Amino acid sequence: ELQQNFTDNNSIKYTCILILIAFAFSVLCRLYWVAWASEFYEFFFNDQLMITTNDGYAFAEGARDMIAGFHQPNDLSYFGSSLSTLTYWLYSILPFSFESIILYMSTFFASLIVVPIILIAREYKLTTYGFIAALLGSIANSYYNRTMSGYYDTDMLVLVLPMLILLTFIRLTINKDIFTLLLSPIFIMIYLWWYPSSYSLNFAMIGLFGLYTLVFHRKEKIFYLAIALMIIALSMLAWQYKLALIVLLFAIFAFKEEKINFYMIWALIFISISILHLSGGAFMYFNVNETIMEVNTIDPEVFMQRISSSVLVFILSFIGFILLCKDHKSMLLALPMLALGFMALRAGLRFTIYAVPVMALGFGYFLYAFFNFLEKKQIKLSLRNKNILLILIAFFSISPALMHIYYYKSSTVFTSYEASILNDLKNKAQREDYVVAWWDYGYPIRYYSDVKTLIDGGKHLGKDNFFSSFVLSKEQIPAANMARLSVEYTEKSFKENYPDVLKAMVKDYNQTSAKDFLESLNDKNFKFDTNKTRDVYIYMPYRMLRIMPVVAQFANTNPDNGEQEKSLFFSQANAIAQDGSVMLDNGVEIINDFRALKVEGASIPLKAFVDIESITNGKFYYNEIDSKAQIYLLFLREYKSFVILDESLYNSAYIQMFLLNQYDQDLFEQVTNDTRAKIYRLK
């Protein structure tokens, strides 16, 4: 059991048992969050847990539509998407419900990385260390997080595929066996299919592979053939030309023994790169980039963590990677994927992922590395002891990622309540009907309602967010006007191809600027030169409260000149203490009988205090204070939650029509009403 030599074993059977254990383990772990989120009712729909990233419903939707047979005209469905396609294959191949497939797919597929980890390890005659590099790599924070049992987004193979490509590269370097020639341009293709954006990453890995062929291999044949086939796999050529051209250029090389000279290969290279060439190789709005969670920044603490779940382990891993490299050279071929992770630090939070698997092999090597110092600096160490030491070093370094997984308990994109509200919305609304909501929501809104939306997590530039921002944060009447004009003109963009929709409306209402247009959606009696084609809704859920500032900013940003119109003072927080001095999270207090706030030392007069007791019914008590102030304090007793507004947010169609349940009845109709969310419709 424990006295056997595991280090020096690199056998088929062994490698596959370690792949089995590694994989099974990486799956068991994704699978605690299910052990936890099932005892919670708010997390279920159609008798199964729901998805964990907005992004997901993009594909879900799409796939569902693929399962139907068709998606509608000009609604933005991901019918045919990589992920959609694969879900809809595995669906018609399996006895499990869409929701459960959609659910566990992430868990399955992303556990595959555990395979190239230990395989590459094994190329380096270090399998057992690979096993470790992969237990670690299949759990590390960033990776787990973007790959939970819930995460039905493109991310499940984003690191499996290039990591396969790289073991491909290396196996070519070492064994120079021809099967590699078929695999890397195949992998490189699949990756490119199943994530259009891996483009640059692939380009880069190929560049490297070439400069590297030039250094360490400027003589070997197979290699230029490979650069050329990879390069062909990169370009944009009907799948058939690729598969074909590859297979011919393969057989000729396997069965033509040796007879091909450099010049004709450099012509294959030049030619192929020509294929590449033939293929490809004023109105200002607020910026959606200082706004996306997934792309927020980091304190290098969490950088390290995210990449390896332990700063000490990060410092061990970096070193292990350095030695591994300047001990093997091929591992050098990982550099791009390292760099991407590091790009995180200035590019985004969501990039650390790229640097997990590599920095794991690194770590693995360091153990080998280290266990050398011992055996090689003369240190009699028996096998019982070496194995116990390995197992402990390992459990020790992995446990942090375990802990993180325990502590990492997401809810769902939405709760049952919200879903079912939307589903209910399906049977009331027509498939061509537009729903105005914020972009965070658009996907779910769509998967659950089959409706069309103005903006989604994909269509969410400042220019696109402007409308949904406006309808939701400006005054009721003008909001009610945007809704109409934004939906209609968004449906017109689909034929007349407006580069700037807002500008379209403007030039189509003979207004000289954009503030003259917008200060003009006020007057309830509004000319309508553009026709009514479908019914428009507006979804206003409690959840969007924490975001009201961020959402409002966009319409606050005057399309004419970048500038932010108003001041925007807003904040939602909870109570912690009372004597009558009440402390609020954000450091704001409520003092002298709900009249004034201590906002960083500054006492402030409340223009009033609103006390809302029934969101559903409209029952509140408007307390008047300092008629000559600007800051409103609200209390939602149904959510024991405090709010802090300024006049214009107090008057924004959302706070007005949701929190206070008051809405101009000749403009709207309250289609749905719940403490959790409302839905209105234009008349």
Binding site: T52, T53, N54, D55, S142, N145, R146, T291, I292, M293, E294, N296, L349, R350, W438, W439, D440, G457, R546, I547, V550, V551
Partner: peptide, 8 residues
Amino acid sequence: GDQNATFG
């Protein structure tokens, strides 16, 4: 954190 959502 890791989700294509708005904050904050």
